[PDB]
């Protein structure tokens, strides 16, 4: 029982002033909508977040009018379903946690909001997880659990979903294994940090401010301490 550390990858947002590929955010959301939205939840992100990031306004309204919501009461007031324009989150494929656990073979899947920012490692962990299925050399494998080295315990109740039934992107970008995995890893990076673009914009502006300002404050400090640096004593007794 060990910890295999994930490698280091040259990401397109890896540099300290680089941002995400918004086109990759779009096609990674396409990945989440096609294949991944049946076991995993992403209950802290709404469709209205996507109104300026990787879709226009009308397209996200279509993508949120495709799904029923089950809004609350009316005048008589049982409940009723609803298309829903923007005020809806991503709706909960399995309602309860233990209902999700009993639907799978135990081991309910964690939600996909903070996975990139919460696994002792970045999206390299998610990439190596999603791509690193292999051969088990003489281990237990208790009747439903697969082998993947990038996981504590080496026993995952997730069937390997990345290339099995390729999802056929809308743009015509060729669906290999690595490209669809890179897309969903970029989208999960975005779903972890919705502020990454604007925070590195303000980081650039703060770098220019503290490169343009802090030498002047140091100059003014030295200019007001300039007297006592140059003061000179002499000793007069009688």
């Amino acid at each position: 029982d060990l910890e295999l550390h994930p490698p280091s990858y040259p990401w397109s947002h890896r540099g300290l002033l680089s941002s995400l590929d918004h086109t990759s955010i779009r096609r990674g959301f396409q990945v989440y909508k096609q294949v991944c939205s049946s076991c995993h939840s992403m209950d802290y992100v709404a469709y209205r977040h996507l109104v300026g990031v990787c879709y226009t306004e009308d397209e996200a309204k279509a993508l949120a009018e495709e799904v029923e919501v089950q809004d609350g009461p009316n005048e008589d007031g049982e409940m009723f379903m609803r298309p829903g324009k923007l005020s809806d989150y991503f709706p909960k494929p399995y309602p309860n946690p233990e209902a999700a656990r009993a639907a799978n073979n135990g081991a309910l899947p964690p939600d996909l909001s903070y996975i990139v920012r919460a696994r002792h490692g970045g999206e390299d962990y998610v990439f190596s997880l999603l791509t690193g299925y292999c051969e088990p050399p003489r281990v237990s494998l208790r009747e439903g659990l697969y082998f993947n080295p990038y996981f504590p315990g080496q026993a995952i109740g997730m069937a390997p979903p990345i290339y099995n039934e390729v999802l056929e992107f809308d743009d015509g970008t060729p669906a290999t294994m690595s490209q669809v995995a890179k897309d969903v890893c970029t989208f999960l990076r975005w779903a972890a940090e919705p502020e990454h673009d604007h925070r590195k914009r303000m980081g650039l502006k703060m770098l220019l401010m503290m490169g343009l300002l802090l030498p002047l404050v140091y100059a003014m400090k030295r200019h007001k301490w300039s007297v006592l640096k140059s003061r000179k004593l002499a000793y007069r007794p009688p």
């Binding site: 002033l17 680089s18 941002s19 918004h22 300026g52 990031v53 650039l204 502006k205 220019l208």
Partner: protein, 57 residues
């Protein structure tokens, strides 16, 4: 060295003139610096932002 003499004589002799000077400088510098940093952040990627690909879409 003569170029700072009239600068001291017109914008640093008083106090209210100095305050008006740094206020007008703050607004002009705010505009010019926001335009400059926007140009730098567009130039540093040029292929990744939502803006140019969305007007291509």
């Amino acid at each position: 060295p003569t170029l700072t003499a009239r600068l001291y004589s017109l914008l640093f002799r008083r106090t209210s003139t100095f305050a008006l000077t740094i206020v007008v400088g703050a607004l002009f510098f705010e505009r010019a610096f926001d335009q400059g940093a926007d140009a730098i952040y567009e130039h540093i990627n040029e292929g990744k932002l939502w803006k140019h690909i969305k007007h291509k879409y």
